[PDB]
Amino acid sequence: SYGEDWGRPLCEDYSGDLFVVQFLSEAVARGAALMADIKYLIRPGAQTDVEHF
Amino acid sequence: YSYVERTGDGVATTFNFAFTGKGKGYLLANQIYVERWDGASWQSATGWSLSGTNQITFLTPLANGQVIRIRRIAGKDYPFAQFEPGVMLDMASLNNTFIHLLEITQELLDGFYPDGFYLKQDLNMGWNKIVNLMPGTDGGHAVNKTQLDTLSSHVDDVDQKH
Amino acid sequence: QDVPVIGLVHLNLDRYPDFTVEITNRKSGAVRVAKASNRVGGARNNVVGY
Amino acid sequence: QSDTPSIMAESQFNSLSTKLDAVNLCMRAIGRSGVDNLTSGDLDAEDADTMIDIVSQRLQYNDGKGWWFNREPRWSFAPDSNGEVVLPNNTLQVLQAYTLNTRKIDITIRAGRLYSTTLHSFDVSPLVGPDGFIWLDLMLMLPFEHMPLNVLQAIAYQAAAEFIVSKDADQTKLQMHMQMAANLHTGMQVEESKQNRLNMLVHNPTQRNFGIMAG
Amino acid sequence: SIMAESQFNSLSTKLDAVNLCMRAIGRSGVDNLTSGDLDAEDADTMIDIVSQRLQYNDGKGWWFNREPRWSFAPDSNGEVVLPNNTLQVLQAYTLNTRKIDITIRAGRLYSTTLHSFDVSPLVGPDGFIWLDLMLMLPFEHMPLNVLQAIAYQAAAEFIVSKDADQTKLQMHMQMAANLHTGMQVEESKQNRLNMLVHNPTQRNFGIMAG
């Protein structure tokens, strides 16, 4: 730019878009990992015994 | 009158107070308020319980020479009883109301005033004394002649070394 | 044994001065006093005279 | 000349603000008229007094937080050299302050003074903040007075319904009071968020952080 | 030879509202507001209770209750005192004014964040203080529609304070709501507003791109 001793990079012009991509990728990866987990559940008063199952 | 001063020392944990008037001297338990003297300020106290009609009980014994003050503050904004036609008119309310209205004036005679109080008019004392003042720190504070004597002493020493 | 729980008691009177009603309990022993007066606001018998 | 000062000077609204009027209102829908004095000698007079006091903090607490007047932002206690700090007067609940660079430490309120479970020491010297006086958020209990006019009406009707069901057993009177008081509570709770307004952005840490970037 | 009845128009007078409240129970209204009948007082109180309650309605009140921006200018001593009865008080939301919490204690207001009872540090730049509030004007000098609406609602509640037939209760409650929505449409007719110009984001979008 005029009156500038040093230049500027190209990625400076799209840092915002890159940050948006980073945020969305983090969100989708975290959601996939969180859904990949397994936790199971049994209803109280199950009338069944878990150890034999 | 209303306010009562008490000193505490030793194992003593129960303090008795007496107010002017019939019976217990007060209308509501909410009128009783407890204060503790820290030696510098009018700090309030905690851990007090009303055990008797005219006595209070602390949880722990007071320390050496601790000073407490039991006062009684009445309702400052409404009359004690509100009268309407068609209500069960009882005479006890009339007796209590007069005592309560007499009570609101009582501590004013003692010397208590609500916080945020200032005489906004030009007061006069008709050539009477003002006594028992401390030296003032800030410029807005008034000064006794103890400072005046100190300043008079100060001008003397500077003049004598002159 | 099947005893109702009394909520309020209404007394019908024709001539009455101020009086008191004493309540006593045979189990706790506490006593409660309810004081009644003949002065009721807005009534004829409210003049300071009589 | 003119008549505006003359005519409406006599006008009277007579709004309800005293605790006794709430008791007198609570003393209706039940039979006998209200008492002229708060103390009096009638047993039902102080029974209504107890109801107002009990229902006070119940209503003021809502579920979790109360209204805006119960809010009390960042405090400083600076616990004494003797030991732990005593909680001022009566507090409904105590929460930790949530400023930056402040680790989560447990605070639990016992009688007055608080207790930290993780330390298991009833005195809390070491968990004091760096040059900070254990900043935390709490909620006082205002008395029946020192409250807005609307909440006074809300607490009275709610207490009246509880008094009726304890005292009497009537479906019609009870049904109206419960329904009508609930109408006022929603009609009053609606403005609580309308007051001290907050929005999705800015306040939410992740939304504000996203807003600053890519913008 | 006889006083007769003075002409009444609609129900402007408070006494006539009590007479309507006295009715619906088979007893007629008293001629004088004070009189010596104990039941007129219960009706008299009931009108008073509803007035403070019905004007505030749900959240903000009607068009005549609310008052625009004021100026309080807290003194040198400290906080400023709210006038008589204020249903609710809010800070003015104009531009270049930071949002500072205002809370009303008994009478005069309070500041939770400053935690002090006075509000002196919260004086704005070159403007003392600006806030919005609503009064509760008394039973008289009212729009005539509220006068009839308030009477039926209070009378309907009055029924069930004293024994009333199911028939009398159900009709009055139905009409009290019906009369309430009858006046509520006029609220939009007065001080009418739209998304445009009024909404900050809609006006901002409107001026740009055009």
XYZ file of C-alpha atoms in Angstrom, chain B residues 84-86 116 118, chain E residues 38 41 75 77 108:
10
model
C -61.309 1.893 58.349
C -65.062 1.882 58.927
C -66.753 -1.495 59.198
C -28.556 10.830 54.685
C -28.521 17.296 56.546
C -70.374 -2.617 55.388
C -66.740 -0.954 51.407
C -28.960 15.723 43.764
C -26.685 13.983 48.279
C -36.318 5.975 45.194
